[PDB]
Design a protein around this ligand. Structure first.
Ligand SMILES: NS(=O)(=O)c1ccc(C(=O)NCC(F)(F)C(F)(F)C(F)(F)F)cc1
Ligand SMILES: [Zn+2]
Length: 258
């Protein structure tokens, strides 16, 4: 015990150990599509993942992270609302117990079945642990998942999950190409926010794609067989590992598209 997504340690409790939970730039948020203003000054995002080197996949008890080699500028995010260069460190998802919930951001109050976060850190701060202490330290690219046709590029991820069922298990996961998780369009909303799990640091530029990717029911069913618990402990399925939308407060969500 410590924080989680159970009845007794879930999002509504996190503020007790992490008072920033009630802060001024918390994530996720609802994206009201009528209120987000088109900003003709935003650039097209530059997602440069040709040289991405995945290493390992880890069940950390709250989700699973696909980890990359971020010792050099291989897979980077630039442009859009960003100044400078952000290195990909990991991706993970948040998902529901059923298809009608799971995403952290919402769009006109609609919840998607899951949400992918591609986490990047600003190289001008030298390492990730320094970057999370800065208001422009991270850029997280958020992509919604809806259930329909299978996503071919997700299958390698789904097929390794049986080997990392429980908290603390990892497996080698080399040569995975995250370009296969992108939608066709890179149109996005952006706003300043936070990590969505404790310690909830207010260090993130959020970039949320408008176009969801489609994954199959079978694919997401396999995410739902993972466990929050460690090996041999009472089984708690890893489902509903999402934080609900937080107050927007004094923030503007900008759209890259008209
Ligand atoms: N879901 S999210 O918003 O994309 C998202 C992305 C990344 C983290 C994350 O690195 N937490 C871990 C951490 F950074 F807080 C940390 F413990 F490593 C430290 F020490 F603070 F640096 C959390 C949420
Ligand atoms: Zn996340």
């Amino acid at each position: 015990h410590h924080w989680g997504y159970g009845k007794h340690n879930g999002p509504e409790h996190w503020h007790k150990d992490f008072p920033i939970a009630k802060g001024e730039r918390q994530s996720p948020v609802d994206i009201d599509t009528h209120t987000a203003k088109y900003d003709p000054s935003l650039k097209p995002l530059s997602v440069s993942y040709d040289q991405a080197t995945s290493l390992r996949i880890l069940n950390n008890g709250h989700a699973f992270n696909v980890e990359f080699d971020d010792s050099q500028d291989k897979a980077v995010l630039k442009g859009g609302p960003l100044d400078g260069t952000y290195r990909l460190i990991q991706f993970h998802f948040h998902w529901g117990s059923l298809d009608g919930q799971g995403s952290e951001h919402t769009v006109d109050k609609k919840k998607y079945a899951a949400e992918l976060h591609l986490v990047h850190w600003n190289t001008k701060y030298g390492d990730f642990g320094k970057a999370v202490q800065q208001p422009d330290g991270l850029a997280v690219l958020g992509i919604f998942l809806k259930v329909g046709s299978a996503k071919p590029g997700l299958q390698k991820v789904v097929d390794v999950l049986d080997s990392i069922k429980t908290k603390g298990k990892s497996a080698d996961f080399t040569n995975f190409d995250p370009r296969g998780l992108l939608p066709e369009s890179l149109d996005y909303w952006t706003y300043p926010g936070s990590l969505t799990t404790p310690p909830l640091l207010e260090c993130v530029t959020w970039i949320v794609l408008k176009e969801p990717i489609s994954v199959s029911s079978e694919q997401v069913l396999k995410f739902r067989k993972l466990n929050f618990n460690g090996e041999g402990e009472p089984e708690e399925l890893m489902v509903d590992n999402w934080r609900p939308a937080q107050p927007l407060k004094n923030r503007q969500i900008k759209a890259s598209f008209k």
